[model samples]
Every structure is written in C-alpha cells, then in structure tokens.
Target chain A: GVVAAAEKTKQGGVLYVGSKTKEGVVHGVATVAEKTKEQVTNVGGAVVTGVTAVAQKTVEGAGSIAAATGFVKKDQL
Target chain B: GVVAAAEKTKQGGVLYVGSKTKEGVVHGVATVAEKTKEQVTNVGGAVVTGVTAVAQKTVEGAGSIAAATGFVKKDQL
Candidate 1:
C-alpha cells in the first residue's frame, strides 16, 4: 500500500524530498566542520545521531496525530 | 577539511545513518497512510515538508552550538 501510494506522487517526489533533506543536513554539518577545522567525521557522526533520534520521535508523533485524525489505525502503527 | 573529516569515519557511517533515518521516516509515514486509507502521496508529502522544516531549524541550532564551542566560525555559517 505504501509503495502504491508513493507511486502516486509525481516524479518520485517523496524520494526527492528525502534525498534533498539529507543533502542539506550533510552540507550544514560540513560547513560547521570546515569553519571550525573540526573533524568532519566526528561532527557528522554526532549530528547524524542527534538528528536520527529527533526524526524518530517526530515521526512517531506524526503517526499519533494521524491516528487521532482517523488517517491512521492505531493498531497499524 | 570537511571532506577530510568525512573520510575519517569508518565505512561511511555518516551516510549510513542519514539513509537509515530517511528510510524510517518514509516507512512510518507510509504506514499511517495505509492504515487510514489516505493518499500516501499527500501524507508523505506533508510529513516530509514538516520534517524538513524541523530539520532546518535543528541543524541551525547545531551550527550555533558548534560555533559557540569554537567548532565552527560564526562567519563561516
């Protein structure tokens, strides 16, 4: 069902959005590392970890909202 | 310098993290759409837009923190 839904979006919009967001995050972290002469690997690693945690919670909250709105079945999540 | 730093992380850990997070977010959104019998495209699109906004701010804050710690030059951001 998800795959079918994804196909409805024109020109892989969902994929594009995810790719673009990831690129922006990477670039942002890189800029900080470059400016501070910090280790990009370490900085990137830390930021990625933080972002992943945040994203997880954010997605979960979104699911909850969707469920409340009847856009999602609670048991499906 | 940023490239150099990225190179230091073993086995492209940064890339892996970003990819993993994206996958999780997409799947979460998809699940909501399927359960609710909602349009996957619309739900995915909305979630992506919201997540992007949140991420932009989060990254900015991270940059600020890096700058304060001398890990990033304020002017560089």
Candidate 2:
C-alpha cells in the first residue's frame, strides 16, 4: 500500500514539475524577447535621428560652399 | 541628449530583464527538480521495503509447505 502511494505521489510530482518548468521557460523567453524588442526599437530610433542630423549638416555645408563659389546667392542659401 | 538617454535606458532594461528572467527559470527548474528528486527517493525506499517483505513471505511460505508435506520437520520449520 505504501509503495503504491509513493509511486502515485512521485508520478504526480514529476508531471507537475515538468509542466511548471516548461511554463517558466516560456514566460522567461517571452519577457526577455519583449524587452529586447523595446531596446531594439529605441536604438533604431536613435540611429535614424543621428542619420538625419548628419544629412542636414551635409546639406548645409553644400549650400555654404555653393554660395561661396557664386553658384547661388547668399540670400538664396 | 534625450535620444541617447533613452537608448541607454533601453539597453539597461533589456539586459536586466534578460538576466532576471534567466535566473527565474533556473530557480524554478531547480526547485522542481529538488522536489521530484525527493519524491523519487521516497518511492524507491517504499519499493525496496515492499520487495523485502515479499521475499520474506515467500521464504516463510516455502518453509511451511515443506514441513506440511513431510519434506522437512515441523520443528525445523
């Protein structure tokens, strides 16, 4: 009787543990993935902003040079 | 400045969440494994005791039959 009881208990424990562990893994993965996505989005936005700034600087420098070379009036620049 | 700050914050959040989630999974797995191990050990002990009891009963029955059939003396049994 004791043997059977223990056997059943062990079976139940094994099943519960397997299920709990799987859920933990799934949750952990999901949490990390979400955070990663947010981080990636933030970094991407920064990169776009940086690129935009560099482009504006390049355009301004080109206009200044063009005006100095009399290719366009200073007022036009 | 705001962009850089946001980027850094996002990076830190991603790293922290990843590490924390990994730890949670590890801890959950370890906890379940420990419980399962204990349950298994208990079942094992019960099985051993059951086997021992069965063996003893078999030996006793064999002795009793032998004596009843005059194959062995009752006193010896």
Candidate 3:
C-alpha cells in the first residue's frame, strides 16, 4: 500500500510520489505505468520480491500493472 | 541485485514493481529503490546520483536507516 498522493512536476519531467513509510517520499523522473497489467505502472523496484513478482506484462508474456500503482501514499510518504 | 517484482495496489494506494531495463518499459512514480542503499537500489536514478539512495532509517539522531532498505525491481515494468 504505497503511493498515496502524487504531485507531477509542472515541467512534466518529475513526479513526487508519497510513500507508505509515513513520511517517505519518492522523487525522480516520472514513469507512467505501461499498457500491460502485469508490469508496474505507478512505481518500481531495484531487485524485486514478494507480491511484486506477480506483476503482468504489457506486450505478451510481459507483466501486469495498475493505474493507481504509480500513486504516492499519504502519511507514508 | 535490485528488486525483482511487486504488486502494491488494491484501492488503498498502489504498489506495482518490475524493471524495464531488459525490454525498456519504466513507468511513473514508484521509484521503490529509494530507501536506497549506500550505492544504488537497482532502479533509482537522476538527481541522487542515478541511484535511489533510499534509507532504512534506524532513527539516526534524526536521519539514517537500517536493514536492506526498500525495494521492488524486475526484468521489465
């Protein structure tokens, strides 16, 4: 349950995603979730594990992702 | 080794993970790597030296961290 509130930079390059860590903040280039439901859309990881592995694909045998997946949490962020 | 997979989201907020480096399909928000290690979270980049520079926050006087830190990587997302 990460990503609560997100503030996409008006410049259209950065997106500040809130985290579930309660004060955590995700800042960087804005990457929109892909077309596939398997792949992540809202967020991403470095290595990967847990439920994260269950992602789907966007283009055949790829991964799944949700539209809200890329949102920023509230208190967590 | 970065994150491998993830799928955060079910109405509460959002949490989907996966890498696009393999096929190139990154998304917006969710840079789960931060909570980054001393080096890189495997999926972090930009501003913070391309790495997520996330933290474990062991309660360092007020700033720091602990454990393996945050994650959520994959082959493509």
Candidate 4:
C-alpha cells in the first residue's frame, strides 16, 4: 500500500502518442517531477507529523506504563 | 496498520497490579514511554525515508512520463 503512493499516477492518456501534438514535450518530465515531488513531500510531511505525535504520546505513556510495570523511572519522567 | 504502532505494547503482566510488589511502581510508565517513543521514532524514520524515495522517483519519472504523455514540459526539465 505504501508503494502505491508512487504508482498512483496515470500517464496512459492519448496525448502520450496519437495526439500528434508536441507543444512542450521537452519539459514534461521536469514539470511532472516537480509536481510529483511536491505531492509526495506532502504525504511525507503527514508521515512526519504522525510519527511526531506517536513519539509524544509514547513518552507521555512511559510514566503510566513504568509505574505499573518496571519499564520507566520516576526521576527520569 | 499505522495506529498499531502505538498499541503494540503488552503490559498485561503481573507488574501492572497483583504483583504485590510496590518496588518501582513510580517509574514504570515513564520508562515505557521512552522506549515506546524510540521505537515509534525508528518506524517514523523508515517512513520518512520511504516517502523521500517516493518523492525522488516521482520527480525523476515526471520527465519520462511527461515526454511520453503531455503532462510535463521540455524547458522545465
């Protein structure tokens, strides 16, 4: 499912071939690359946020878990 | 699958309660929190790397895809 993040593009349109139009074929990949990078970066940003939240909560819960078990220490908290 | 990152802990042992031992109940959760955060952070790191790679490839493929289709331009690449 993660890889799907990359393969989600659909470049099977008519303009690829039979369109017989070359208005800007030279800069197509460049633009595509830029836009695709931006999109993927957005997704990456979300992942970073997700991980940040996870880490925060994990540290927060350490006290509760440590108290119940032998996981964490009090002075450290 | 993402949330599982948080709930993957198994604290149902005798340390939580009936252990009849108050030796270190004060610092259990704290330790758990720290370790948990570290683990989740590692997972997050992998995710960040994955997303980074995705963005890189996405941008790289942009030109190829655009040239084949009509997505990107020439000068932009």
Strongest candidate by TM-score: 3
Per-candidate DockQ vs. reference:
0.03, 0.01, 0.04, 0.02
Overall local distance difference test of candidate 2:
0.14
2 or 4, greater by DockQ: 4
Candidate 1 lDDT over A1-77, as tens digits, reads 11212212233213322343332121211111112221222211111211121222222222122111111111221
Interface RMSD of 4: 28.9
Candidate 3, which segments miss by more than 4 Å at Cα?
A: A1-21, A25-77, B1-7, B11-49, B59-77
Q: Per-prediction count of colliding residue pairs?
A: 0, 0, 70, 25
Model 1 chain B scores worst on lDDT over the 10 consecutive residues at B44-53
Ranking by TM-score: 3, 1, 4, 2
Per-residue lDDT of model 3, residues A40-73, tens digit only: 2222433222111111122121222222222222
Ranked by lDDT from best down, the candidates are: 3, 1, 4, 2
- Candidate 3: tens digits of C-alpha lDDT, residues B1-77: 22223233444244423321222222333333323224233334111122223222122222211222232222322
Q: Report the C-alpha displacement of residue B65, candidate 1, in angstroms.
A: 26
Give the CA lDDT, 0 to 100, for residue A37 in model 3.
27
lDDT of 4: 0.17
Q: What is the TM-score of each candidate against the true structure?
A: 0.14, 0.09, 0.17, 0.11
lDDT of each: 0.20, 0.14, 0.26, 0.17
* Model 4 lDDT tens row, A35-73: 122122321112221111101111122112211110111
Task: Please name the candidate that would achieve the greatest DockQ relative to the true structure.
Answer: 3
DockQ of 4: 0.02
